[PDB]
Design an enzyme around this catalytic site. Structure first.
Site, PDB file in Angstrom:
ATOM      1  N   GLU A   4       4.567   3.300   9.339  1.00  0.00           N
ATOM      2  CA  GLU A   4       3.128   3.380   9.333  1.00  0.00           C
ATOM      3  C   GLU A   4       2.563   3.340  10.750  1.00  0.00           C
ATOM      4  O   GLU A   4       1.603   4.036  11.068  1.00  0.00           O
ATOM      5  CB  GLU A   4       2.496   2.237   8.541  1.00  0.00           C
ATOM      6  CG  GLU A   4       2.596   2.442   7.031  1.00  0.00           C
ATOM      7  CD  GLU A   4       2.268   1.214   6.247  1.00  0.00           C
ATOM      8  OE1 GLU A   4       2.456   0.083   6.790  1.00  0.00           O
ATOM      9  OE2 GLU A   4       1.876   1.373   5.059  1.00  0.00           O
ATOM     10  N   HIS A  41       0.815  -1.214   0.000  1.00  0.00           N
ATOM     11  CA  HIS A  41       0.000   0.000   0.000  1.00  0.00           C
ATOM     12  C   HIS A  41       0.855   1.274   0.000  1.00  0.00           C
ATOM     13  O   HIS A  41       1.864   1.348   0.698  1.00  0.00           O
ATOM     14  CB  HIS A  41      -0.880   0.077   1.262  1.00  0.00           C
ATOM     15  CG  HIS A  41      -1.913  -1.001   1.332  1.00  0.00           C
ATOM     16  ND1 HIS A  41      -1.693  -2.249   1.841  1.00  0.00           N
ATOM     17  CD2 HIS A  41      -3.204  -0.996   0.897  1.00  0.00           C
ATOM     18  CE1 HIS A  41      -2.805  -2.946   1.753  1.00  0.00           C
ATOM     19  NE2 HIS A  41      -3.735  -2.228   1.192  1.00  0.00           N
ATOM     20  N   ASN A  94      -3.455   2.226  -5.703  1.00  0.00           N
ATOM     21  CA  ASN A  94      -2.871   2.517  -4.417  1.00  0.00           C
ATOM     22  C   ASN A  94      -1.825   1.476  -3.998  1.00  0.00           C
ATOM     23  O   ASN A  94      -1.412   1.472  -2.838  1.00  0.00           O
ATOM     24  CB  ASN A  94      -3.961   2.644  -3.353  1.00  0.00           C
ATOM     25  CG  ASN A  94      -3.418   3.154  -2.029  1.00  0.00           C
ATOM     26  OD1 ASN A  94      -2.679   4.138  -1.999  1.00  0.00           O
ATOM     27  ND2 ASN A  94      -3.792   2.504  -0.930  1.00  0.00           N
TER      28      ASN A  94
HETATM   29 MG   LIG Z   1       2.348  -2.231   3.536  1.00  0.00          MG
END
Ligand SMILES: [Mg+2]
Ligand SMILES: [Mg+2]
Lengths: 241, 241
Positions: free
Chosen positions: B123, B85, B106
């Protein structure tokens, strides 16, 4: 009911009570005769140019614990110092108690070449930040350091300690937890033509040198992480890297 | 009407029109087959855990200008890549069009060691910022670099260009003009156990390596000064110095 600090005024001052005015909040030192720290809050309503300078003993202190105008006689000639403001006059003299900016609790014997040079250039950029449409406040804490023998005012018999350096910690808007910040430290003997951008430091250095904790109401994790990291506010004040 | 950028979405993308969703705003590249940049806005209401990953061709693009699920067949065996992602699923999966996070516009072929290692740890810290009481938004722009040949997906006949690196530019609350910011850049070959804090860069470096102007609505002087200065937001994400 006046908060000049936003994120907690400093701890570690020699006085357990601080003076709170619209112009600034200050913590006096009855031994040195100068304020340990002075905190202030610039907004669009606070700058005022061209005010006069009637130096006066601070009426809120015991006169034995601070200087009087007479104490500065001959200091410029002997030491090449000025009556240097801690909280800057032109940035704050729009407030209702502005004459307190010229009380000697807000003044120290500051080398003229510092006062009129890099310290003034930093003040000018600090004040200019408030002209930005998205900057609604500048919160600053400033004060002295006492790390070497600087001599004595010739015009007094009072025991006192002339600062050897000065520091200034700045953030914009609400809190250094989320907003840009800066810290600077200048020796008394900084050359007149010095670039203030060359005097950036961490808040931690200032705390270790002064015995204070600045921004003392911030969470511990915020304090630890940000105080050892130089800030990026100086990049908006004309500094590079 | 949806503003995923706050201070102007990036300029310089290969497509003159961008796709605007609640989940993100994205600028596609019909040549590389991957997004040039993806901009998104995390708030307390956007994270959602445990959503599934039904990869799908983006219905808003011409199918010849993007990848389809079939195109990834055999990619992990050939190149040790995952379907990675750009805008992160867990941080945004509460939005009203969340399934678009698994559209292949994406996604890119991202080395597994990066995807599952430093990229994932970044993240996690990016998402954790929004838990702080004083942080109401995280605005991020992320995208690829295209600097060396990384090989070709074996499962497609389409011309495409696998990225050689990935970057992320982050700020909190309202604007990097007043709020903390960060930028990170990771090669595809970043080791699995890498510490994401070792990959901090300037926004300027990312711009120079992409042809983009990020935060393109900021005033010129704000762009010039802040984009060449690494930010302090990583210190709130566990990083030191
Ligand atoms: Mg990832
Ligand atoms: Mg002065």
């Amino acid at each position: 009911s006046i908060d000049n600090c936003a994120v907690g005024c400093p701890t570690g001052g020699s006085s357990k009570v601080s003076i709170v005015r619209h112009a600034y909040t200050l913590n006096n030192n009855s031994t040195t005769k100068f304020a340990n720290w002075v905190a202030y809050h610039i907004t669009k309503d606070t700058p005022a140019s061209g005010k006069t300078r009637n130096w006066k003993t601070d009426p809120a202190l015991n006169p034995a614990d601070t200087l009087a105008p007479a104490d500065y006689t001959g200091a410029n000639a002997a030491l090449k110092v000025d009556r240097g403001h801690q909280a800057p006059l032109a940035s704050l003299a729009g407030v209702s108690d502005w004459e307190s900016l010229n009380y000697l609790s807000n003044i120290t014997p500051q080398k003229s070449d510092l006062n009129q040079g890099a310290w003034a250039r930093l003040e000018d950029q600090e004040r200019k930040l408030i002209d930005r449409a998205d900057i609604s406040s500048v919160y600053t804490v400033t004060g002295p350091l006492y790390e070497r023998d600087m001599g004595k005012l010739p015009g007094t018999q009072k025991a006192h300690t002339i600062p050897s350096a000065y520091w200034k910690v700045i953030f914009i808007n609400n809190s250094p937890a989320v907003n840009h910040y800066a810290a600077f430290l200048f020796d008394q003997n900084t050359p007149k033509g010095a670039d203030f951008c060359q005097f950036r430091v961490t808040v931690d250095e200032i705390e270790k040198r002064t015995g204070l904790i600045i921004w003392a109401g911030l969470p511990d994790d915020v304090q630890a992480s940000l105080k050892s990291k130089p800030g990026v506010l100086p990049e908006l004040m004309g500094c590079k890297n």
